[PDB]
């Protein structure tokens, strides 16, 4: 599909049994969600943006369904003010910018 | 052009006769550039950042050329990690997300 940018490019994603609304974010290197228990080991990480940094947990090889496309990769979990899909998963579903 | 996301979507812009690199950012409502001096009136503004609100200067109706595509709109100037082109100007240049 083609998603215009008049509005925030928000989509509902699925990880296991869980739905989240998340923003397709070409300005994010990484995918970050709030309020998510995920399976497996995790390591602390700090990620930055406008305003400064937040502390997150890094989980690897996590399946994320995005518009019928199956991504698998790193998901960060922490107090992000918006759930975010970053380039690490956008690339896997074949997402590009076009103008 | 078509810009893939294996690398940061950095492009050259021209603003006030200056060339700068900027990130095409679908996760940003607004365009925020690093500290620089711009034309005329500006309004003190606050934008919601990580950990709270950050002070920026708001300049309205500024011409910005992005990969040779013309936009005229609001540019914020303040402490950003990167020059960021947000949806306010991505829409003007006809930028979409596609997969």
């Amino acid at each position: 599909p083609q998603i215009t940018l008049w509005k925030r490019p928000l989509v509902t994603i699925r990880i296991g049994g869980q739905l989240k609304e998340a923003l397709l974010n070409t300005g994010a290197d990484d995918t970050v969600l709030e309020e998510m228990n995920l399976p497996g080991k995790w390591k602390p990480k700090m990620i930055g943006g406008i305003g400064g940094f937040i502390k997150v947990r890094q989980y690897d090889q996590i399946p994320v369904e995005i518009c019928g496309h199956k991504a698998i990769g790193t998901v960060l979990v922490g107090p992000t003010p918006a759930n975010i899909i970053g380039r690490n998963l956008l690339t896997q579903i074949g997402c590009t910018l076009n103008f | 052009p078509q810009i893939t996301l294996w690398k940061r979507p950095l492009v050259t812009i021209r603003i006030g006769g200056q060339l700068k690199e900027a990130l095409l950012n679908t996760g940003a409502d607004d365009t925020v550039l690093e500290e620089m001096n711009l034309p005329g009136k500006w309004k003190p503004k606050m934008i919601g950042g990580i950990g709270g609100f950050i002070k920026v200067r708001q300049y309205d109706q500024i011409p910005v050329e992005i990969c040779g595509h013309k936009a005229i709109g609001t540019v914020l100037v303040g402490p950003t990690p990167a020059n960021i082109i947000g949806r306010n100007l991505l829409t003007q240049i006809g930028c979409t997300l596609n997969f």
Partner: peptide, 7 residues
């Protein structure tokens, strides 16, 4: 690393 969300 940079997640440049912006509201």
């Amino acid at each position: 690393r940079q997640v440049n969300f912006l509201g």
